[PDB]
Every structure is written in C-alpha cells, then in structure tokens.
Design a binder for this molecule. Structure first.
Ligand SMILES: Cc1ncc(COP(=O)(O)O)c(CN[C@@H](CO)C(=O)O)c1O
Ligand SMILES: Cc1ncc(COP(=O)(O)O)c(CN[C@@H](CO)C(=O)O)c1O
Lengths: 405, 405
C-alpha cells in the first residue's frame, strides 16, 4: 500500500495486523478462503466510482459502457462455470442473493420448506430472528438421527404436509453431497419451486466435485467468497424464464446501485475458477478434508455423518465431554481457528453446542497438503484431549507455528 | 495494478477504460464522486478475507480482533462526524441501510409517509416496484407547485390524515435545505418515528453546510459514497435506545457477514471527512453548485426551485421544449454526464421527464472551480439551445476537452 499508511496509520496498522494474523493462524472456518491479488486489485479499483443501477445495456445512467463490459464478463464467466441460463452478479452478499429470490417467488406469509437450522440449514433459511423466518412461514426437514444424512423421506412428507410454495436445499454445515435431483422431484410432486443455496459448495460445483444444482433448480443462490474463492458478495443463477423477474427483484426490488468494483472482482474470481489449476485446487480441498476427517477419527474423534464428501466436517465432541464453545476457545488459544456449531439433535443450545465446524478451503489455498492435515489433526487431538494441560497447549502452539512458518 | 493486467487482460482493459472515461468526461451525476487512493487501497485489502458476523467484541467467529479495530474506528469516526449516539457501519448500501430501519420499526403493511417520488423522493421511499412500497403502505407529501419547496403544511395534513408509523424525510433530487426540526415536530404530533435519509447530503452535513438531521431523527440513514465521498456502501445512525434493535436488524436481520474491507474504506473516508480540507472541499461543492445554477439561469435555463442550497440542481427543460431524456443524450454526445430526472408536477412520464439532474461533487473533487462552472454552463447552453447543430456539438466537445485536459 502507498497512500493508506500515510493518510491513515490507525486503519493501516489494523489492516497490517489482520494480514499477519491470516498468515500466522491455522484458518479452519469452513466458509473462509484467501482471494488472489488480482481479485483484490479489482475491488480496490476506481469502479468503486460509478453508479450503474440497471443492467448492461439497460442502465439508468450514462457512461456505463465500460462497467457493462465488466458485468457481462462476470455474467458470462458465471454462465460458463455453472451452465445456468441467466446470472445476476449484483447481489451484495449471499443474504441479498437469497432475499431477492424470496422477494421474487414469495408473498409475505407463504410457506417455505428448508433444512433444519440445527442440522445444517443456514440463518437465511428460516431463522425466526432472520428476515426469512420473519417474513415467511418456514418449515424444516431434518437429517437421520444416526447417519446424519438428510432424510429425503422426511423432506417429502414435510413438503406434502405443509405444501410450501418454495423448497430450499443446501446448507452452511452439511458435510455430505446433497441430492438435487431428489429435491426437485419432491418440489414437482407438490408444485413448489426449488431453490438451491450452494454458497458453501460453489467452488466444488465449479470444479465438478459436487453435483451441480443448476439443472435441477429454478433458482440457485451462492456467495462468491467461500469455496469459489471470490470477493465477498452474492450471485443468483436461474432459468431464462425467471431472468427478468430476478433482475427486477435485485433492482429496483431490493438493492440500489451495484458494487461495480466487486462485480469486477467477481469476474476475476470467475476467470480463475475457469482455469485448470482452480480445478486442481478444489480437488485438494476435498482430498484434504477427507484426510483431515480420517486423521481426526484416528485421534478418537466422532464426526457427524462419519466423515465428509466435501470441504467441511463437523466434530461431535460429546465423547470428549466438551461443548463446541469450549473446544473453539482452547483451539483459539493455540492458533487454530474453528467455529462452534450445533450438531444434529444437539442437547446444547446454539450458543454452546456439542460440535466444532471445520473446513479445508483456506489452508488448501495456502498450500497445505495431506501431511499438514495429519499434523493439524494430531494437534487438535493433543489439545482437545488434554484441555487442562498447559504443556499440551504450549506444544500445540509450537506445532502450529511450525506449520504456519 | 500488478497482478490484474497479467491474470485478466479483459477485465483490466475495461477497468483501464473506465478510469480514462472518468478522467475524460464531465461528471455531473449528482450522486457521484471520486474516492481517494487510500479509500481504494482499504477496499482492495485482505480484509475482504474475514467472516465477521456480529459486532466488535461480540462476534460469532474467532480471529476478529483486528477487523473489530477497523469497525470501531469507522463507528467512532462516524460518531465524531455526525454526533450520533450509535452507528452501524455494516449496511452494504443505502438501500440496505433503509431496509434495516424499515425492518426494525415497521410491521408489514404499516403506513409510512415519504416524499413524493416525482418531487425528489427516492426509490427506497415507497416506489411500488421497490421493497419499500411492496412491503409497506407509503403515502407522500409534495413540494409547492410554484416554489418547488417541500410543503410542510402538506406533510402535516398527510401525517394527520394517514397516521403513519414512520415519516421519512430526504431525497435524491431536492435542491433545497430540508427542515428536520419541522419534520420531527410533525412526527411527534402524530406519534410517528422520524427517519432521515441523508444519503445525498451527508458530506454537506459532515462539513456543517447542511443542518444535521441527527438531533431530530430517531434514525438517520445514508450512503457512504455521495457527498461524503466514501466507498460504495451504507450506514445507519441512531439514538442509543434503538442501537440494539438496529444492530439486530442488520444482523441477524437482513444481512450476513459484513464487508470488512469496505468497512475499512468507510473508516478511511470518515477520517478524511474529519479533516479541515474536506470541509474546504464541501464548501467548494456548494459554492460551485450555486455558481453553476446562476450561470445556467444566465444562459436562459429555468431551475426547479429557482436555484440550489446544496450540491445539486434540477433544470426544467420545458422552456427549451426538451425532455430530460433528449437533453441527457445530447449532453452525453459531447462528454457531459447528467441524469434525466422528473421535475415536480412533470407532464412527462418518469422514463422521459422534463428535467436533468446535475450535481457538482465530482467535478469539485477533481479541482473545478467557479470559472469551470461558468464554462460548463456555457457549454450546456450552446448544446441544449442548438440541438440540431452539429457545429455547436463539435464546439462543445472541444470545450469539454479543454476542461478535462
Ligand atoms: C448457505 C449459505 N447461504 C447464504 C449465506 C449468507 O451469505 P452472506 O454473504 O454472509 O450474506 C451463508 C453464510 N454462511 C456463513 C454463516 O452465516 C458461514 O460461515 O457459513 C451460507 O452459509
Ligand atoms: C436518498 C437516497 N437514499 C438511498 C439510496 C440508495 O443507495 P444505494 O447505495 O444505491 O442502495 C439513494 C440512491 N440514489 C441514487 C439513485 O437511486 C442516485 O443517483 O441518487 C438515495 O438517493
């Protein structure tokens, strides 16, 4: 940076901090990643500078000829990535992407069927403190109590019982492949629309490592920042038939001027995802997650669903008599970042939990491989199995620092 | 840029374009401005990298110690700037800032009283194609047919008649000072809350050139990008009493993870606004707008409300028998960017209009002064008074290029 350090030492110090922290810690928060310098340069550009309400070639302001090129690049690279008929790259976030689909297809009070929030469903899928649960009538389907795999029979009974206008599939804490074909078949049974929120698995979908929801869903929403490793923001994919309504839901519907600099970073991240090495990267993400899961079970940990099909895993800490809140704090003491996360049928409340959610997308980006996964699992074992030992904690800290350089 | 040009020539070319366009054109869109390099460097940082749902010291993720410093800097610089009891610097946009206040104070279907959309009220103030007008019952107050000044008697009658739960003051196309004390007095008369959307005038408010709404309103919303010259995003200011509810409206209410890199650019823009030269700059903005208004009237143009008290002006083109759509296109032909904009009591529809909206915040940022204002008005006169003359247009183009270097 050149001008920031001189103009704002305080903000620059905190940023420099955050940068060093990102390097020093072992980042295991499943929704995180590290973007590339080109993505950051696109967001730090003068595109931040333009009002561009409307869409390419149909703007409400003159002078949009060049930001229209950037948006169309993003839209077209998305279409290439996911095969969707239409993309809207304006959502300011995953939340806004979900909110626009709900604005489009639902009337206030309508019934929506989503994944149980304590089984993997996201906040934007019906939490009662969230707009989604406040505006609409959300009902949930759950995972099997023993396999922790979505119970498709439960999805179907719930759809048939409650007759939702919309069915939402996908999650923020579900370690197994989701069967989009089954959800769509149930939606058609009850005449509901199908929305897939692939935020967590978008990069895996882009790399062919997770079934693509695009051909099954009427709408697909996602963040551009998790496994897709783009800037922080959202995107909606949908069939051509809903194209105009989704675009109008985004604007003049729920947003105003779009973030064109972010939309330029989206196009840049999409370009990266279209390359072969992003595919090699995603592959390592999943390989790494499997490796880490295996290694954690080798250490004596129980995993929700017994393992993972994607970038993430959930540790059930009941066997070690730990709450997720406790494990998260002790791991934070040695430089390992995870999230507490409720486990299906959790006896503890959401603010305490019986599990920790872990993902490998960030460490994979930084170059960690299977041997690092083994080490990280051994570190987690030493810590979580010896919570009151300061020597275990010190040893773990030294082993964390050996990993992060 | 270093990595963008190599990794993504297509996106880099379009960005480089947009940068050159910004320099070559005479940017008169009233909501635009140019941010500083330090603001851009903060948005192009690794802060983009962190999940930070929740607020400083009350996050839902570990590792937020340094992004909490950046957020608290933004919040505290905002509080210093505007004198508000609480700031929420997470709104992703002016739209999201307004949406969170509406989520907080209103139940679906509630009555809200806002400024007539064709008299200066914004889209997020009740447009029927907007979430605001779809979710709630919006009623409007207008400006006087001859002075084009908000009719406070009309505001009061409308409040007393419709008994709104909320009253919204401010606008995207109102060239005169708004009387926040009168709005609050009316709100108290009918027991309504008072929301001031100062997006357009925030920088003028920050510089003491526009009465501050903070002491009169229960809630104040704004974009961080217009006269405030920050990155593109929103902010909500409010009394301490609504602090928790507004924060919860933002999260877990209507958004998800905040844009911490943008929040760092907000703090940087707030730091700039706190300096003396930002005050000198705002002063020039208003001086320039007055100058330009005067000069336009010298050329024979009628201005809505007969002039301006702020950064913006509205030309009523009926005297020249032009629609705003036509004037916007002919000005675009010579390198001058404006917006068509309905004028109060406009005979034309919103897609055609009888006026052009103009502001001086961008050209002032670039250094234009009173002599440039005189020249720009002379250029606009030559063009709009000789629409079918190609020689007038060519002459204007040369005079535009003399201004932009
Ligand atoms: C499946 C899923 N969908 C939407 C979002 C919201 O995205 P924002 O950009 O944050 O609005 C999420 C977010 N997930 C976060 C926690 O909410 C995470 O760490 O998983 C999501 O998971
Ligand atoms: C008064 C006012 N309030 C909110 C907004 C919305 O902000 P976003 O960041 O764009 O969501 C605006 C926006 N004004 C734009 C046109 O909508 C402008 O050019 O005035 C606003 O004016």
């Amino acid at each position: 940076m050149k001008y920031l350090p001189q103009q704002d030492p305080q903000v620059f110090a905190a940023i420099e901090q955050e940068r060093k922290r990102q390097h020093a810690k072992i980042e295991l928060i499943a929704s995180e990643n590290f973007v590339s310098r080109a993505v950051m340069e696109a967001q730090g550009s003068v595109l931040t500078n333009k009002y561009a309400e409307g869409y390419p070639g149909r703007r409400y302001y003159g002078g949009c000829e060049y930001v229209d090129i950037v948006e169309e690049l993003a839209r077209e690279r998305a279409k290439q990535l996911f095969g969707a008929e239409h993309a809207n790259v304006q959502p300011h976030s995953g939340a806004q992407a979900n909110m626009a689909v709900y604005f489009t297809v639902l009337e206030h009070g309508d019934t929506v069927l989503g994944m149980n929030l304590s089984h993997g469903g996201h906040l934007t899928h019906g939490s009662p403190v969230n707009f989604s649960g406040v505006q609409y009538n959300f009902v949930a389907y759950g995972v099997d109590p023993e396999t922790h795999v979505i119970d498709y029979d439960d999805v179907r009974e719930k759809a048939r019982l409650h007759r939702p206008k919309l069915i939402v599939a996908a999650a923020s804490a579900y370690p197994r492949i989701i069967d989009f074909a089954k959800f769509r078949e149930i939606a058609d049974e009850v005449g509901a629309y199908l929305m897939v929120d692939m935020a967590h698995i978008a990069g895996l979908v882009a790399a062919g490592l997770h079934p693509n929801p695009v051909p099954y869903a009427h709408f697909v929403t996602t963040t551009t920042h998790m496994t897709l490793r783009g800037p922080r923001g959202g995107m909606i994919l949908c069939q051509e038939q809903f194209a105009k309504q989704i675009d109008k839901a985004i604007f003049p519907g729920i947003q105003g001027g779009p973030l064109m600099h972010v939309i330029a970073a989206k196009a840049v991240a999409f370009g990266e995802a279209l390359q072969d090495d992003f595919k090699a990267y995603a592959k390592r993400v999943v390989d790494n997650a499997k490796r880490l899961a295996s290694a954690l079970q080798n250490e004596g940990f129980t995993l929700v669903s017994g393992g993972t099909d994607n970038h993430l895993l959930l540790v059930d800490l009941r066997p070690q008599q730990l709450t997720g809140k406790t494990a998260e704090k002790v791991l934070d003491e040695v430089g390992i970042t995870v999230n507490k996360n409720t486990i299906p049928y959790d006896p503890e409340s959401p603010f305490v939990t019986s599990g920790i959610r872990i993902g490998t997308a960030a460490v994979t980006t930084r170059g960690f491989g299977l041997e690092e996964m083994d080490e990280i699992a051994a570190i987690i074992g030493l810590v979580l199995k010896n919570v009151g030992s300061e020597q275990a904690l010190e040893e773990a800290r030294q082993r964390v620092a050996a990993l992060t350089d």
